Subunit: 460 residues, 4 copies
């Protein structure tokens, strides 16, 4: 008579090493922004369960991504990151997951051709369950909705309480999703020829299909050249999609830390919640736990940069989070907004470039670009977004640095949460399918089209 | 504490699949947990939305490869905990069963001299049958974690349908991890073989086997020397399987996919392949007929009690389309009866012209009780059963198609015998099974060698 | 004191089988057009030497080409054949051979992309040493120069005598060339990336490089997409170039016949002078030895067709030379001329199509297109040639048949034996490098450019 | 009759290469044919235009791979007629030597457990040295077809520089054919192995070897079972080699190519690799210094007479840049002296820190004369020499790097011993060598097995 079902929880594995634990305990002491307010005794319970479950990724996989990213940081691959703004447990379904990966790969092929160079594919998925808040109380006068990792989307005070059981529901969800994403991509869903076939079907039918035919045709034909050529095609059957989410909830993040075998190398501390995680704009304080936390772990990390960023602060990131000068170890993600990315960005890049360190310069053109529409709904303009990428490019091309890649919020559903692009979404259209639990994201059409427009940036 | 999941508030079956499934599930169903329909239904509703543990493309893939084994051109290895447990469903235990299975796969690959299709008893082996309802302690029998708990107490043994969603939850996570594991370094042939070599050094019967182990090293080195030591060797495909025991479970994880033949059909996406057990195989039973509706390759355990004609009905029902490898028939007779009992069954089935995989479950036939109190197996008897399994087949020119064994990566002491000479006295030291005794790491591996030799003769 | 050097000649291998010899003896009895007039006793000597030397090709190689061609006849690959009009012993040098293969592969990549489908590469080489004659006496009043297989190019009566030692010099030459062609292509010379690099260098510098840049750029990028994609590239390191020549001198051709192992299949009679050979316009008489000869051997054969051809005669070819309906066993090569290919061709194709048999429809746009220039020199216009291909296409596209490929005369040298194309060769230019011993051929530039123009035909 | 070739009526060497080559060729040159300069020059002029038998890209390729053998990570096999002949330069003889060499390559590949670089004495082994000018019959000695004819008559033995261009002519044709052969079916591992199996059935000592032959089949089957039985196995690279005996020949086939290091250098494109012989190795001789100007990997035969210090000079001259595998040093001592003589030579050379390939020429040391009149070898002695060749190397931890043998595909009877027990009486039946006696098909193969075992210990 309560419409839900309580799943009961459980034999601890051996603790991490006293030496690393001291280094870790020392790190976590620093003030943590945006953490949830739930009781410590309870968190510790749930963390204890997390520390003994199977991890959503593994060290071999991540060191392997560190190498690929390395190659991006070196300007020889390009990085594509994308998926839901916020992942909601109710919607972590096979169809939704198929569609977001389908989307990511559809751009992947378009960006791959355009970039003329391998693309590294990272999904926002299997862990993007917590967000930062601005406001203590939301408009409905309720405690902020902080991501299903922390609380329910429903506007009922019960729903909103920070509930750390949610840490585990997070975990089961991310697993499930992860393990689908793997099956999907190891099976035919990331075939090049199929993913492309979806792309053709897009051109047949987008309003702006003209805009795209020419390039879509080159792609077909350069693909067909591959079989003309007889190059062994198995590598065309399967695509690697890594998993990323913002590391916000340190209890979950801390919970999922593990030591590597050490067989490949001396044992390191990694975060197995995900493959790479970033630190947001609100949690990035230099002297804070989040930056500290990113310091300890080996995963590739990223840090978001918005307008307040000062090249000197940039640098300090670089010296904190990339002390060893491992290229691609750290990514920095411009999110100025289109109007300011040209002015704001250049200095940063140069100050950072001067350092030594090679970092991925990745453009997030979504978080700088959000505005409320006359009709109620939070929104983003396709043009302003495109545009920021164009600016991001222009900044790097001018400075002779590498435009590492893009970070975007998209989905496979035909949502109407972003205005414009070939479908010409109108503020009224927005009511029809605003099914995002947070930031408005590029619909499957807007994502593709965006990747066409970015492909054309990459060939200039 | 506990975690709370919501009940949703979903594509219609083609009229025929609905009828056939329903007809299917109306028949009598043995060994089903006794929990309420409301609550079972509820659990089902959750599950009918979770992401599947496997996906169709893979099962078809597995089919193509089982056809290979069927036709005599590949060998099947199926191996795992006898009953996985939620408590033990950890990175180490998973990692080590995956390794134990892989290590036998390489020895087996080299002895077959054909590919071994590798199927783990993992990601859903949470449900057992029981023949006596009331346990030895007078407590209700443990049916495995998807139904109830081991802890020997009234409360714990009550059937908890919360276990269905919990079981799936542990299913995904192991699956996720096995996929992650087999596609990163854990399955590098070379890396796996090195593990085997360690075994030959430190085994007590290293010598016995070192020779064959050297011939594999030489095999494997040979590949490099021919400049073919490439991508294929860095990865292996491990398929998830379990007995399709709980119909509220399998029914929930069903999913409807299109067929390249172009009619839609139902796969059970709780595992790549599932098998009906000895106790659930009634021909007009819910399980057999369920097994007739799902696309998945199925297997059927076969008892000593089995008769050629029944086996044929099994074949004409599970395999009404004569697709090779749709149907495995797993013999378990014990070493003492396998020679007498199996052939006629082989001939009549063979006479039909369907090609099934004949697979040998050595473990299940051969169970016995210690005088120290523990349910156990003798390594010697297990080997003998696979032994005469082979002789039966050679003698008819039929294909000994693969083996089904219960093993673990842990150095357990649940089986007597092997190089170790595990003893009834010894069993009391690490006997961590939730259920049937497993070959530990040394014993599976050992049995792998001994089987490959059976393979070379 | 004679400026030459006589190389002495030699132990017979076992004869071919009495049964096949009877079939063969019976076949050769038919009148042979255009054979040389040299003494039979001598021919027999030289044939005896040929029958025991190592063959320039092997059966495995040829059955393997029969399959590829099959695929062309089925409209799924495209056939490219080209090299010298006439090969002269003096010029069968490593540089000249490099350049003609370099040329053939340069078009090969361009046609491959354009065709969107594998191209089968056959060189006119390692055996194109004999030609047919029109005229008993040439203008200089001398016995016709018939190819170095038969006599010397020099205008001295001594040179012109039909000398059957020349059969062997042919053989040594063809070997030498063949074995270079193999080494070259198994080594880096048929790398895709290198061959393409030559192509880029062509665009940088042809006058008509604009015309070509766009497509050249697609090619680069679709190539770069291959490495972006990570497809195993060894297949991109090496190209198979088969050898073809016209089978004119039956003594040489007969001399080189061998029986296969039979291990793959029942033993067949093949011609190991070459991989595939064609029968010319003058030697193709139906009741003649040349057609008979092509009947006996398993090699893929072709027959040239010019304006006099009547679809019924076409058919009889088809029923004679492809009795078993093996697709791609027989190729028929239109050489109407541009003005007539549109009118002349259609009926033939349809009459032949109606038969059952699948034959490669290959366009020779060179032999229909030759005219003498005001300045003395035999010549061909780039446009008329292009044009014939365009017509050949148009004929097939209209009939919904497959345009199998092209047969062309080209070289790697920057000769000026053909007028026009991007360099705008003028009749006066022609004196500068008319180094062809026969028909004027496309210079390395005209060949490429031709392949650009044909690539554009294939994408319509 | 005869065929007449014209004399032409061609890129200048960089001043240094011209000087160095000239300086090179001015030194004294032993064992050179005695024909006139005009005529030799003429022949040269022809040749300086013929297409080369090999090309640079390949020789560099061969170098990279010889470095592998040098470093201990690959094994070198070099095998052919002792002197090819124009008369025998036919599709069958070629096809069968290529096969005989390949068949040893597979047994050897599997025993080394590393790649065998396979180098044929083919496409130019037309020139021999002679120690006595006047032959046993009082006729001028036969120096091989590139110089003169076998036919035992005055006329035939006169040095005919027409032979230079004829020799190239036969060179190309064999080369063309070996390339054609090795890239079409003749070199399929599988196809080759099947040939080996036939050998084990019908050999008289099949048994002796059947075991090892089964372990290769199993090796080779293993590749398929791991799904790696791909393109690489359908082809093998056979490199042409011969002794660089005739300087009018090698000098003519020289060609100048660019170096990726970017300086131009001269390769001899008459073969992939060439070796100086025992009689032509004078340190200040034309051959050694020629061998110092060409880019090609070179090898140097080494006599019993050899001293550690000379061997070092050889290394410091042929290998002045310390590139591994630029230089092979081929021991031939006979079984009786190899153990005593070779080590010190190994140590001093090793002491230098250049890495050479140490290769064993078993045949040349061990020659002896029948009492039936025929020059012969005992299979037993040949094996023993490779034997102690290995012991020497194991004993120093140096790398036994490969072997150089004279074999043929023909069932000849030119060597005593082997499973066949070829006998002095027997030698008179098929003793078709133009020169040194060859291991026939059975004997090469046999020696391959026996060597691989030397390889497994
Ligand atoms: N695996 C390669 C090729 C590939 C397969 N499918 C794809 C889908 C999109 C982009 C690339 C691919 C990679 O990531 O490219
Ligand atoms: N991938 C092939 C070969 C292989 C890779 N890793 C392995 C691990 C064990 C046995 C075989 C393998 C297979 O699954 O057979
Ligand atoms: N071997 C393939 C690819 C290739 C390599 N080099 C080439 C040169 C031109 C055209 C194609 C190729 C083929 O014939 O294509
Ligand atoms: N191509 C590899 C493997 C191989 C192919 N064919 C062979 C013939 C013999 C021995 C080895 C091989 C090699 O040269 O080794
Ligand atoms: N196996 C433990 C921990 C766990 C929790 C959630 C999972 O998804 C997986 C495992 C349990 O079932 O409580
Ligand atoms: N799980 C449903 C069957 C079902 C499966 C897939 C569907 O798309 C629809 C229905 C059952 O138990 O009966
Ligand atoms: N996404 C779902 C369904 C689900 C339930 C349990 C899992 O382990 C995974 C997914 C939820 O939590 O409601
Ligand atoms: N070997 C024979 C036949 C031959 C002729 C010309 C060749 O190119 C090759 C071989 C000879 O030398 O006379
Ligand atoms: N063959 C010439 C040398 C040479 C080689 C190549 C050249 O490009 C020029 C000269 C000689 O005997 O001396
Ligand atoms: N092409 C030349 C050079 C040559 C000579 C002899 C050959 O075997 C091959 C080529 C000629 O005959 O003059
Ligand atoms: Cl805060
Ligand atoms: Cl570009
Ligand atoms: Cl005539
Ligand atoms: Cl197209
Ligand atoms: Mn967002
Ligand atoms: Mn069991
Ligand atoms: Mn012509
Ligand atoms: Mn010799």
């Amino acid at each position: 008579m309560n419409w839900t079902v309580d799943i009961p929880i459980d034999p601890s594995l051996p603790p991490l090493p006293t030496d690393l634990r001291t280094r870790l305990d020392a790190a976590l002491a620093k003030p943590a922004a945006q953490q949830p307010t739930w009781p410590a005794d309870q968190a510790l319970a749930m963390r204890t369960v997390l520390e003994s479950v199977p991890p959503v990724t593994v060290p071999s996989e991540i060191v392997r991504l560190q190498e690929q990213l390395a190659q991006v940081a070196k300007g020889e691959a390009f990085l594509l990151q994308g998926g839901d703004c916020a992942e909601t447990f109710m919607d972590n379904t096979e169809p939704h997951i198929r569609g977001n990966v389908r989307a990511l790969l559809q751009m992947a092929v378009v960006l791959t051709y355009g970039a003329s160079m391998p693309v590294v594919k990272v999904a926002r998925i299997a862990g993007q369950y917590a967000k930062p808040r601005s406001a203590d109380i939301d408009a409905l006068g309720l405690r902020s909705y902080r991501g299903d990792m922390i609380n329910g989307f429903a506007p009922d005070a019960a729903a909103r309480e920070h509930d750390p059981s949610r840490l585990v529901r997070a975990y089961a969800n991310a697993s499930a999703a992860m393990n689908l994403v793997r099956a999907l991509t190891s099976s035919g869903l990331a075939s090049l020829h199929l993913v492309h076939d979806w792309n053709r079907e897009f051109v047949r039918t987008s309003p702006a299909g003209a805009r795209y035919e020419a390039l879509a045709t080159e792609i077909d034909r350069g693909l067909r050249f591959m079989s003309a050529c007889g190059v062994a095609d198995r590598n065309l059957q399967t695509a690697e999609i890594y998993a990323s989410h913002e590391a916000l909830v340190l209890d979950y993040e801390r919970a999922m830390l593990r030591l590597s075998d050490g067989d490949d190398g001396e044992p390191q501390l990694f975060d197995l919640s995900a493959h790479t995680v970033w630190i947001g704009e609100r949690t990035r304080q230099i002297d804070g736990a989040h930056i500290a936390f990113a310091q300890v772990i080996a995963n590739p990390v990223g840090v978001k940069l918005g307008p307040n960023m000062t090249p000197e602060l940039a640098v300090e990131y670089v010296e904190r989070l990339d002390p060893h000068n491992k290229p691609g170890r750290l990514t920095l993600v411009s999110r100025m907004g289109n109007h300011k990315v040209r002015d704001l960005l250049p200095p940063i890049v140069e100050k950072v470039q001067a350092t030594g360190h090679q970092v991925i310069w990745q453009c997030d053109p979504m978080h700088g670009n959000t505005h409320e529409s006359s009709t109620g709904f939070k929104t983003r303009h396709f043009d302003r977004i495109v545009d920021e990428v164009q600016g991001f490019f222009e900044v790097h091309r001018a400075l002779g640095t590498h435009p590492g890649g893009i970070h975007v919020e998209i989905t496979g559903e035909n949502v109407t949460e972003c205005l414009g692009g070939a479908q010409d979404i109108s503020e009224t259209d927005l009511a029809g399918r605003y099914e995002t639990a947070c930031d408005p994201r590029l619909n499957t059409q807007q994502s593709l089209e965006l990747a066409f427009l970015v492909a054309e940036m990459l060939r200039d």
